[PDB]
Amino acid sequence: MELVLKDAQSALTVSETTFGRDFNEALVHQVVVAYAAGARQGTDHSQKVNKKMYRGALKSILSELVRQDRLIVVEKFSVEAPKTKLLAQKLKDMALEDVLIITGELDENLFLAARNLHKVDVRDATGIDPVSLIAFDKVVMTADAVKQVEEMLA
Amino acid sequence: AAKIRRDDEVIVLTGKDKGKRGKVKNVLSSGKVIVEGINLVKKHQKPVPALNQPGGIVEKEAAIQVSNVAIFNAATGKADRVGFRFEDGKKVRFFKSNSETI
Amino acid sequence: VLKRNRSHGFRARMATKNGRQVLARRRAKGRARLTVS
RNA sequence: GGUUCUCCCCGAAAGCUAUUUAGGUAGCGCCUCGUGAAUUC
RNA sequence: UAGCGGCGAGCGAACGGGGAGCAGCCCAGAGCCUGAAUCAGUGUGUGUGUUAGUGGAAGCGUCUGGAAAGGCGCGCGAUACAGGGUGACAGCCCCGUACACAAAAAUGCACAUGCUGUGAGCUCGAUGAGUAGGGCGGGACACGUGGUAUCCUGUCUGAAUAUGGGGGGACCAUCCUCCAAGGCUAAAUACUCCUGACUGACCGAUAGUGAACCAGUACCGUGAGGGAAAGGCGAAAAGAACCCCGGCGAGGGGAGUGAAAAAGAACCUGAAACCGUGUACGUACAAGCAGUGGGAGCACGCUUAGGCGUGUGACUGCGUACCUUUUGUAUAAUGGGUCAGCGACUUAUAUUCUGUAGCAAGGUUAACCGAAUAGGGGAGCCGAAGGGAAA
């Protein structure tokens, strides 16, 4: 569908099937439980999850976040210098407190800026888990990040 | 590298006597300092037949935690943190907030 | 002391290879009394 | 000797049958949960 | 798994492929030529690391309370909120983290120079003799000397170099390689008694380890082996001057100190069971493991008449106590003194069956690798030619 922006208002094209599918409550729950079990160390509780089931869950969560406008697509999100204040200010003006900065490529300046903040977390598209996506109140993506998400989801 | 030393003007930050100034008499290895004139404790001194027979009630000084006191700036009239800096190869202490050497 | 240390002492076990394994367990479990005297 | 706390509905047997090789192998009408189910009884 | 066994339960291989976190050497070398190339050992100097340290920004105040780490209003900080301690739950009052520096000694991985160094390229040759087989006398290879292969061969003897031997998923045949005494081969993978850092849907004094402190303890045995209980110190010891009673004690009562003293060396909070005091009710004519219910009298608070409720409650009526073990348990047949704490997991590894959920005629990868759960990878297990006994 069409993903409305808030700064450039530039149209974005995303596959309807991978972002508009119904919300599979049962599938999402099983993946989340499996992810939590895998986090343990039993000091093994890891559970197998089918690749299609894992992918299907991510599509469902992404669709739900879009519907509940918890997902915001923006242009490049970078900080000129590795200072937490700059990141904090760039989020306060945006009125974001619990956000997940999912960027197309990991940037050291952004990574260092968000490392101290606990309500603010920065990750790459590869490093995404269902638990983090649901837990974080808002998720802001980049155009490149969305594009790479489209292809690897397929 | 101790902020509080043998002869320092300190002000209490917390406790029943917060805000009163004093001079540290000695510092214990357990992170405690003894400052005269604030932490008065009435100790019932048991009499002894030795050379000393003070008996009665003595007004001793009870040690307090190092973190409970701060060096008095003596210029801004308020407590201030103290750090270390190297000058001509000698480590010295300095205040903050218009930091100046001791 | 007389007929007690000559057969149940420290040197009574080190004289052969069989008694060496007996004093080996005293090293892992060091009690207050190693041997009688 | 002992299958442990609580709880709602339902719930196989006595001296027997075939009959060997004995503290047992095939096997029990009536009864239970699910399915099939024709006025069949 | 293809095989093997009274084909009873069991035990038990290889090539190819999917994954390269492997790096393939020296001697039999004469002669023209040596301190060569590739490397190691032993010293010094420079540069980069490991093992002891230092500097290192950032919250001032007020209300309640004895005391503030939390609350309200205004800010700084944030490559740093990993954790714990600092009078109550602490980024910024302390102890630890970014950034920036030092080398008198020792050690490890690339590079200048020096001494001793088993030593290359080109040309001219070679590709491993007390052995195989056979004879006499034994044992171990599951097999008693069998229809018997292969492995080891003391003493007395003895061949050959495409005219002799083995292998190509083993009759006979052909071509190539190979055909007996040499010398070496790192790391990863195995293993956790000691150090530092880090981690957790493990536990918190009958738990965990015999043992959280003076636990490899007191104590017992000839030695050895084996083998208990016990911190809930307080934020800071402010851990009772003086006076009274008494035995110049123990124990207890005042005062003083402290936010709190039935927490006073049994010392934060102090349950059940056992054993007492004060008040109220019943019993000295009551029915033998009698509890609830019905009923009268009395007491501390119903209550602007209201025998409304609880404990106690003379007397009446109904009923052969309870659990385990059994063809029965009211039994001269048998078992437990009670309370508190603790206590006999349905897990891991195959197969089979059921329920739940994603592409709709590509449903599924394990280990390893990976910005360490996604992506990438299909060599297997479970399926996609039914109908047809089978074909």
From Swiss-Prot, chain A:
Keywords, comma-separated and alphabetical: Antibiotic resistance, Repressor, Ribonucleoprotein, Ribosomal protein, RNA-binding, rRNA-binding, Transcription, Transcription regulation, Transcription termination, Translation regulation
GO annotation (BP), single: response to antibiotic
InterPro entries: Ribosomal_uL4, Ribosomal_uL4-like, Ribosomal_uL4_dom_sf
A GO cellular component annotation in the UniProt record: cytosolic large ribosomal subunit
Outcome following mutation: A113V: Does not regulate the S10 operon; assembles into ribosomes in vivo
Keyword Nucleotidyltransferase (UniProt): no
Transcription as UniProt keyword: yes
Annotated consequence of substituting V120D: Does not regulate the S10 operon in vivo
GO MF annotation terms: DNA binding; endoribonuclease inhibitor activity; mRNA 5'-UTR binding; RNA-binding transcription regulator activity; rRNA binding; structural constituent of ribosome; translation repressor activity
PANTHER family assigned: 50S RIBOSOMAL PROTEIN L4, LARGE RIBOSOMAL SUBUNIT PROTEIN UL4M
Other remarks in the entry: The erythromycin sensitive allele is dominant over the resistant allele.
Entries under HAMAP family matching the protein: Ribosomal_uL4_B
UniProt function note: One of the primary rRNA binding proteins, this protein initially binds near the 5'-end of the 23S rRNA. It is important during the early stages of 50S assembly. It makes multiple contacts with different domains of the 23S rRNA in the assembled 50S subunit and ribosome.
Family statement drawn from the similarity comment of this UniProt entry: Belongs to the universal ribosomal protein uL4 family.
Description of how the protein assembles with itself and partners: Part of the 50S ribosomal subunit. In TnaC-stalled ribosomes forms part of the binding pocket for L-Trp with the leader peptide and uL22.
Protein name: Large ribosomal subunit protein uL4
Organism of this sequence: Escherichia coli (strain K12)
UniProtKB/Swiss-Prot annotation, chain B:
Gene Ontology CC annotation, any one: cytosol
InterPro entries in the cross-refs: KOW, Rib_uL2_dom2, Ribosomal_uL24, Ribosomal_uL24_CS, Ribosomal_uL24_KOW, Translation_prot_SH3-like_sf
Biological process per Gene Ontology, one example term: ribosomal large subunit assembly
GO terms assigned for molecular function: large ribosomal subunit rRNA binding; structural constituent of ribosome
Superkingdom, taxonomy of origin: Bacteria
Keyword terms of this UniProt record: Ribonucleoprotein, Ribosomal protein, RNA-binding, rRNA-binding
HAMAP family in UniProt: Ribosomal_uL24_B
Similarity annotation: Belongs to the universal ribosomal protein uL24 family.
Quaternary structure and interacting proteins, as annotated: Part of the 50S ribosomal subunit. Might contact the SecYEG translocation complex when it is docked with the ribosome.
Protein name: Large ribosomal subunit protein uL24
Protein's organism: Escherichia coli (strain K12)
Gene: rplX
Swiss-Prot record, chain C:
BP GO annotations: cytoplasmic translation
UniProt entry tagged with the keyword Ribonucleoprotein: yes
Single Gene Ontology MF annotation: structural constituent of ribosome
Cellular component annotations (GO), alphabetically ordered: cytoplasm; cytosolic large ribosomal subunit
Keywords noted in UniProt: Ribonucleoprotein, Ribosomal protein
Similarity comment: family membership: Belongs to the bacterial ribosomal protein bL34 family.
Quaternary structure and interacting proteins, as annotated: Part of the 50S ribosomal subunit.
Protein name (Swiss-Prot/TrEMBL): Large ribosomal subunit protein bL34
